[PDB]
Amino acid sequence: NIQVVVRCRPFNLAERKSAHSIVECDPVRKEVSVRTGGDKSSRKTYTFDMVFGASTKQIDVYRSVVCPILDEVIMGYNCTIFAYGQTGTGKTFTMEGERSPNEEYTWEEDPLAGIIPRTLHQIFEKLTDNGTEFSVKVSLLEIYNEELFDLLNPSSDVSERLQMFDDPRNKRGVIIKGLEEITVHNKDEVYQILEKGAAKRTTAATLMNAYSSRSHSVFSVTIHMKETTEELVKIGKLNLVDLAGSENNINQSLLTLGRVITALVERTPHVPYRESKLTRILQDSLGGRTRTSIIATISPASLNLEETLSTLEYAHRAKNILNK
């Protein structure tokens, strides 16, 4: 029920100057195949909900996985997309993207743009003149060493950690004290909010060891919706989650995520949500009422074989998770 897709990254310039890809993707068979030994070899094979080869562009990812998810958010559902995988495989690439070099494109037209910018820009486009009044708010909550950080609040620095509490009102919910929600009033406000995030992230990285590889980041967008004739109320939420790299100090949230998934697929009565910040904040995305997808990202380099195999096995198990 949880939707699991595989994305392979392409080779960097250093791998050319010349590397052989050990990963073969077959989208129509929806399968990924890894070469483990070597004219004559052994291979490992996995079927996923969708597979995306090294030639896949950002627009292909958005149109195939995000577009249907965003339609469901607009319908009034909560959705979550995780990116999972080894550092270096394209978790941030997929979730955020990058800017094309030399100011070639405006941010809205940049084909290297990832899920977060494309989504924000499309919400405004989809709801431009249907019967739906709406507002958009975003937050970016991050977890490093089991501490909480607000990367969007422009009035306090990143030494300041946030406090998490059980929410009495709705069970299995939490309240993050001091977490800021920025109203995104229109498309022309999006980019600078994203820039503020990047700036504060650069501060985080100088103060915290391997921040960009070791932190989990949860970019949340909330769409409040109202249609008329009588007022019909829709609230849509989407979490865009860029996990800490899965490579094997200790990452309690990452360890706990794995153990939660294990419990859910084995149908164990006890599921250890409370054992980390990440699984408490996202418990509804794991066997709850939220529609969830996982993008498992992998490398094509034979160097990365073991971690590529670990990610695939991990992601494949997760296919068996049921929610809603």
Ligand X SMILES: Nc1ncnc2c1ncn2[C@@H]1O[C@H](COP(=O)(O)OP(=O)(O)O)[C@@H](O)[C@H]1O
Ligand Y SMILES: Oc1cccc([C@@H]2NC(=S)NC3=C2[C@H](O)CCC3)c1
- Residue with Cβ nearer ligand X (9 or 118): 9
As measured in angstroms, the least distance from the Cβ of 148 to ligand Y is 19
Q: C-alpha distances in angstroms, 20 versus 2, 34, 308?
A: 32, 12, 15
As measured in angstroms, the least distance from the Cβ of 203 to ligand X is 8
Q: How many helices (H) and strands (E) does the chain have?
A: 10, 14
How many whole angstroms separate alpha carbon 256 and alpha carbon 69? Answer: 26
Q: Which residues touch 62 (CB under 8 Å, ≥6 apart)? A: 115, 118, 119
Strand partners, 24: 33
Contacts 24+ apart (CB under 8 A), 90-97: 90/7, 90/9, 90/297, 91/242, 91/243, 91/245, 91/295, 91/297, 92/212, 92/242, 93/9, 93/297, 94/7, 94/58, 94/61, 94/295, 94/297, 95/219, 95/240, 95/241, 95/242, 95/295, 96/242, 97/58
- Residue with Cβ nearer a copy of itself (208 or 309): 208
Strands 182-184 and 174-177: unpaired
Is 200 part of any known ligand binding site?
Answer: no
Give residues in contact with Mg ion (CB under 5 A). Answer: 91-92
From residue 247 to residue 286, the character string flagging contacts with ligand X as x (rule: CB under 6 A) and all else as - is: ----------------------------------------
Give residues in contact with a copy of itself (CB under 8 A). Answer: 13-14, 17, 99, 101-103, 106-107, 154-157, 188-189, 191-192, 195-196, 202, 205-207, 209-213
Residue 117 makes contact with ligand Y by CB under 6 A: yes
From residue 26 to residue 65, the character string flagging contacts with ligand X as x (rule: CB under 6 A) and all else as - is: ----------------------------------------
- Residue with Cβ nearer ligand Y (187 or 224): 187
Is 86 part of any known ligand binding site?
Answer: yes
How many whole angstroms separate alpha carbon 47 and alpha carbon 274? Answer: 32
Identify residues 197-216 at the interface with ligand Y (CB under 6 A): 198
- Shortest-Cβ-distance residue relative to Mg ion: 92
- Residue with Cβ nearer Mg ion (115 or 184): 115
Residue 9 makes contact with ligand X by CB under 6 A: yes
Radius of gyration of the chain (CA): 20
Q: Do residues 254 and 275 make contact, with C-beta atoms less than 8 angstroms apart? A: no
As measured in angstroms, the least distance from the Cβ of 79 to a copy of itself is 28
- Residue with Cβ nearer ligand X (199 or 235): 199
Binding-site sequence positions: 85-92
Site residues (CB under 6 A) for ligand X?
Answer: 9-10, 85, 87-93, 98, 245, 297
Site residues (CB under 6 A) for ligand Y?
Answer: 96-99, 107, 110, 112-114, 116-117, 194-195, 198
